[PDB]
Amino acid sequence: EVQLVESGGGLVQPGGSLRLSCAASGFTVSSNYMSWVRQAPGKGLEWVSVIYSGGSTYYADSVKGRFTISRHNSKNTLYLQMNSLRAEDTAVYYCARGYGDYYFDYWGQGTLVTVSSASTKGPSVFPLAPSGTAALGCLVKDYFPEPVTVSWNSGALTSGVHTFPAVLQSSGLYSLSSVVTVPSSSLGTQTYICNVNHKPSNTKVDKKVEP
Amino acid sequence: ITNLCPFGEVFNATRFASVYAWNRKRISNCVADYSVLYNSASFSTFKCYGVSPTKLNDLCFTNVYADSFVIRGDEVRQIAPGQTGKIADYNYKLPDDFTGCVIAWNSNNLDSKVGGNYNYLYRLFRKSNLKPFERDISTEIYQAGSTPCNGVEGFNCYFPLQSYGFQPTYGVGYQPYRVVVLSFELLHAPATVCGPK
Amino acid sequence: DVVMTQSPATLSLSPGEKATLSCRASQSVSSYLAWYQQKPGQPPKLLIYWASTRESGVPDRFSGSGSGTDFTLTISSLQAEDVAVYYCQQYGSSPLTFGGGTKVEIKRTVAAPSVFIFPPSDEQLKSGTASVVCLLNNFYPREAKVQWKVDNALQSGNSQESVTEQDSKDSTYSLSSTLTLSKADYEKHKVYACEVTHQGLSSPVTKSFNRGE
Ligand SMILES: *[C@@H]1O[C@H](CO)[C@@H](O)[C@H](O)[C@H]1NC(C)=O
């Protein structure tokens, strides 16, 4: 019943600005305590900012003077404006309803903010040739930044699908392999298409994998 | 010199009030020795904003309002002009042009109980910040989700008052602190509160 | 400020056991503590608040205790879907600080990997880059060794490994080793082999392919 849907995450240059939006359903943000909490990739959670029910705003010491939490009451929406972003602000941000900035019972899905001087690059997708059972997949290579979402057959196949986490290469671009194990009965009779979707570069790849 | 003001009935009171229902006593028609407060060793916090502390025995005000309550140790800094917090927004707001003295002292030996003292409450949820010197003792249910929350408590309908747990083994900043706010306000009625001659 | 320390940094216990996660504050934060459960690729879920009170919708196997500096989160019976990172978070002090996190792992039975090797695709090979992928599927424990043989060539550091998180369904891992070559440095060798050494294998499994077929 309570949902928090975020938007506005993406790649931004250092010193740039970015305006994260958290729409809410099931409660009004004009009368609730809201927090933005960030998580560095591979590290723990860190509280960023809070807005009270009366409108009082508080920020962490590392973000004070740069960020600005606000809300716009007539549409049930919470905003976080970010200015002069440094290198350590690359993180996944969550909007969270709080019980009087004490504990956060409902959390947003989270959006990734990447701060680097690199350019957005569309991924390259290559099929993996399959040989009981057999594994087949597709490799997403040389993209920036995270994330790449890989689905199989328009999301109709979610069993046996392993989407590996992306690794940083020495060239600075990421790569992830997505595999799925299929028994040999439907191997030669069913066509499998991996939907590679890249929101930052707006790249849609429907590359079929065939024996 | 006759008829000293009853500061003993305010500072040395047996039972103080909570911050959402803070007590107000109108000290008037008496003479007040403020220097028996400033030279008292018990008070941990004594901040006078609009007036110098030693000059209180000379200035004459038409009345003093003594607002007494109990808060946490870390929440003492919010009892000041222009500060913001839970207490400043929803419990007790001082104006920006506040003249008066905020006095606070540790009362861990009185208001703390081994099983916790849940007799002291503070307002956590409110739709808007309080105006300066506004009292809000309403205990109605807080409509946080704008569903048809028809009075009954439950999901997205919170009780607005949270209880300070007070125990003697708590650290400094969680121990209870008794706060008396003296507001010397001077209407153009004839003044009746002065220092000793 | 309060520095919030969790112990142990990682915990691996067989299912059906009782897990005790300890959290310790640098100051005394009374009972102002909450616990959060974060699945991989999923927002944190509040488990308990006020150091003892369960959130509604949280099963009864989670419980909490402790006060002041020391706190414990107790899981009375570990099951398969409790593979997550658990955070203790104080809210007594003015800045809200989270703990370092504790990763909780499930000790299932030892499973040998299913090993596949994938050659570079020919549409990749005209972009100058070759990638050979060695896939290990549904194995436990996490510790496995992947050695690349290029007609018995002493390969050293030319590959990158990626491991999925432990599955909530059957507590098995999956690993992918990617070996990258130049296109003119790809075709000078014929037969490629991926050798895997694991606890569940009596001999290291070698999967090989030929370039010419
Ligand atoms: C409270 O009582 C003590 C001793 O009875 C006294 O020293 C102190 O001044 C009193 N506080 C007042 C009058 O505010």
Residues in contact with B127: Cβ distance below 8 Å, sequence separation at least 6, in sequence order: A31, A53, A54
Whole-number Å distance between alpha carbons of C211 and C213: 6
Whole-number Å distance between alpha carbons of C53 and A153: 44
| Beta bridge mates, A143 | A174
- CB-based burial of residue C80 (10 Å sphere; 0-12 exposed, 13-18 middle, 19+ buried)? middle
Q: Which tokens in the block code for residue A136? A: 């087949």
- Count other C-beta atoms under 10 Å from residue A82's C-beta: 22
Q: Which tokens in the block code for residue C63? A: 């419980």
Q: Do C18 and C61 form a contact (C-beta atoms < 8 A)? A: no
Q: Do A210 and A194 form a contact (C-beta atoms < 8 A)? A: no
- Count other C-beta atoms under 10 Å from residue B165's C-beta: 18
Judge whether C49 is closer than 8 Å to chain A, CB to CB: yes
User: Do A56 and B125 count as a contact with CB atoms less than 8 A apart?
Assistant: no
Whole-number Å distance between alpha carbons of A108 and A6: 7
CA gyration radius, chain B? 18
- Count other C-beta atoms under 10 Å from residue C154's C-beta: 8
- The DSSP 8-state label assigned to residue C42 in this structure reads S
Whole-number Å distance between alpha carbons of C21 and C10: 10
| Beta bridge mates, B159 | none
Whole-number Å distance between alpha carbons of A121 and A60: 33
Q: Which tokens in the block code for residue B18? A: 């909570």
- For chain A, give the longest Cα–Cα distance: 64
φ, ψ at B132 (rounded to 5°): -60, 135
Q: Do B126 and B89 form a contact (C-beta atoms < 8 A)? A: yes
CATH value of A124-209 in 1.10.3720.10, 2.160.10.10, 2.60.40.10, 2.40.50.140 = 2.60.40.10
Taking alpha carbons only, the member of A133, A134, A136, A131 closest to residue A207 is A136
> What is residue B128's three-state secondary structure?
coil
> What is residue A124's three-state secondary structure?
strand
Q: Which tokens in the block code for residue C201? A: 């294998």
**Hey, where are the domains in chain C?**
4-106, 114-210
**Alpha carbon distances (Å) from C180 to A99, A117, C77, C96:** 51, 26, 44, 45
- The DSSP 8-state label assigned to residue B81 in this structure reads T
User: Do A31 and B129 count as a contact with CB atoms less than 8 A apart?
Assistant: no
Question: Which pairing describes strands C10-13 and B161-163: parallel, antiparallel, or unpaired?
Answer: unpaired
Whole-number Å distance between alpha carbons of B110 and B104: 14
Whole-number Å distance between alpha carbons of A192 and A151: 10
Superfamily for C114-210? Immunoglobulins (2.60.40.10)
CATH 2.60.40.10, applies to C4-106: yes
**Hey, where are the domains in chain B?**
1-115+168-197, 116-167
Phi-psi region of A100 (alpha: psi -120 to 50; beta: other; left: phi over 0): left
Whole-number Å distance between alpha carbons of A28 and A5: 14
Taking alpha carbons only, the member of A43, A77, A45, A81 closest to residue A63 is A81
Whole-number Å distance between alpha carbons of B10 and B34: 13
User: Do A139 and C133 count as a contact with CB atoms less than 8 A apart?
Assistant: yes
Whole-number Å distance between alpha carbons of C24 and C39: 22
Taking alpha carbons only, the member of A144, A165, A158 closest to residue A194 is A158
| Beta bridge mates, C85 | C38, C103
Amino acid type, C104: V
- Count other C-beta atoms under 10 Å from residue C156's C-beta: 8
In ligand 1, the atom with minimum distance to the C-alpha of B40 is: 9
Q: What's the gap in Å between B6 CA and the centre of ligand 1?
A: 11
Which of B5, B9, B12, B103 has most ligand 1 atoms within 8 Å of CB, for mutation?
A: B12
Residues in contact with B168: Cβ distance below 8 Å, sequence separation at least 6, in sequence order: B108, B109, B112, B113, B114
In ligand 1, the atom with minimum distance to the C-alpha of B12 is: 1
Give the residues surrounding ligand 1 with Cβ less than 6 Å away.
B 7-8, 11-12, 40
Supply the DSSP string of C104-159, one letter for each residue: EEE----BPPEEEEEPPPHHHHTTTEEEEEEEEEEEBSS--EEEEEESS----S-E
φ, ψ at B57 (rounded to 5°): -75, -10
Taking alpha carbons only, the member of A104, A86, A92, A90 closest to residue A32 is A104
Phi-psi region of C142 (alpha: psi -120 to 50; beta: other; left: phi over 0): alpha
Task: State which residue of chain A sits closest to B84, comparing Cα positions.
Answer: A56
- The DSSP 8-state label assigned to residue A206 in this structure reads E
Question: Which pairing describes strands B161-163 and A133-143: parallel, antiparallel, or unpaired?
Answer: unpaired
- CB-based burial of residue C112 (10 Å sphere; 0-12 exposed, 13-18 middle, 19+ buried)? middle
Phi-psi region of A172 (alpha: psi -120 to 50; beta: other; left: phi over 0): left
Taking alpha carbons only, the member of A107, A84, A95, A80 closest to residue A17 is A84
Whole-number Å distance between alpha carbons of A70 and B144: 18
Whole-number Å distance between alpha carbons of A76 and A22: 9
Supply the DSSP string of A143-173, one letter for each residue: EBSS--EEEETTTT--SSEEEPPPEE-TTS-
φ, ψ at C95 (rounded to 5°): -85, 125
Q: Do B70 and B141 form a contact (C-beta atoms < 8 A)? A: no
Whole-number Å distance between alpha carbons of C173 and C108: 11
- The DSSP 8-state label assigned to residue C94 in this structure reads S
User: Do C116 and A108 count as a contact with CB atoms less than 8 A apart?
Assistant: no
What is the rounded end-to-end Cα distance, in angstroms, of chain B?
8
Whole-number Å distance between alpha carbons of C43 and A114: 18
Å between A132 CA and nearest CA of chain C: 12
Taking alpha carbons only, the member of C89, C47, B123, B148 closest to residue A52 is B123
In ligand 1, the atom with minimum distance to the C-alpha of B11 is: 14
Experimental technique, in short, is cryo-EM
Whole-number Å distance between alpha carbons of B197 and B141: 53
Residues forming CATH 2.60.40.10 domain(s) in chain A: 3-115, 124-209
Chains that touch A (3 or more CB pairs under 8 A): B, C
φ, ψ at C99 (rounded to 5°): -80, 180
- Name the helix (H) or strand (E) containing B9: helix B8-11
Residue given tokens 């299929």 in the structure block: A182
User: Do C101 and A47 count as a contact with CB atoms less than 8 A apart?
Assistant: no
Q: What's the gap in Å between B12 CA and the centre of ligand 1?
A: 6
Residues in contact with C93: Cβ distance below 8 Å, sequence separation at least 6, in sequence order: B74, B173, C1, C2, C27, C29
Whole-number Å distance between alpha carbons of C142 and C159: 18
Taking alpha carbons only, the member of C90, C111, C89, C83 closest to residue C19 is C83
Whole-number Å distance between alpha carbons of C51 and C74: 11
- For chain B, give the longest Cα–Cα distance: 63
Whole-number Å distance between alpha carbons of B83 and B72: 16
Whole-number Å distance between alpha carbons of A42 and C85: 11
> What is residue C21's three-state secondary structure?
strand
- The DSSP 8-state label assigned to residue B61 in this structure reads B
Whole-number Å distance between alpha carbons of C106 and C142: 11
Q: What is the dihedral of CA C165, C168, C169, C171, to 10 degrees?
A: 60
User: Do C178 and A167 count as a contact with CB atoms less than 8 A apart?
Assistant: yes
φ, ψ at A106 (rounded to 5°): -120, 130
CATH value of A3-115 in 2.60.40.10, 3.10.129.10, 2.10.109.10, 3.40.190.10 = 2.60.40.10
Q: What's the gap in Å between B7 CA and the centre of ligand 1?
A: 9
Residue length, chain B? 197
Whole-number Å distance between alpha carbons of C17 and C14: 6
Taking alpha carbons only, the member of B60, B10, B67, B54 closest to residue B31 is B60
The alpha carbon dihedral of C135, C136, C138, C144 has a sign of negative
Whole-number Å distance between alpha carbons of C85 and C1: 23
Give the Cα-Cα-Cα angle C178, C180, C181 (nearest 5 degrees). 155
Supply the DSSP string of C151-205, one letter for each residue: SS----S-EEEEEPPPPTTT--EEEEEEEEEESTTTTT--EEEEEEE-TT-SS-E
Q: Do A13 and A86 form a contact (C-beta atoms < 8 A)? A: no
Query: Half-sphere exposure of residue B193, counting CA atoms within 13 Å on the CB side?
Result: 21
| Beta bridge mates, B182 | B66, B101
Q: Which tokens in the block code for residue B180? A: 């008396």
Q: Do C91 and A105 form a contact (C-beta atoms < 8 A)? A: no
In ligand 1, the atom with minimum distance to the C-alpha of B8 is: 13
Q: SS3 sequence, chain B?
A: CCCECCCHHHHCCCCCCEHHHCEEEEECCCECCCHHHHCCCCCCEEEECCCCCHHHHCCCECEEEEEEEEEECCCHHHCCCCCCCHHHHHCCCCCCCCCCEEEEEECCCCCCCCCCCCCCEEECCCCCCCCCCCCCCCCCCEECCCCCCCCCCECCEECCEEECCCCCCCCCCCCEEEEEEEEEECCCCCCCEECCC
Q: Do B185 and B63 form a contact (C-beta atoms < 8 A)? A: yes
Judge whether C194 is closer than 8 Å to chain A, CB to CB: no
Q: Which tokens in the block code for residue C71? A: 């706190």
Q: Do B15 and B110 form a contact (C-beta atoms < 8 A)? A: no
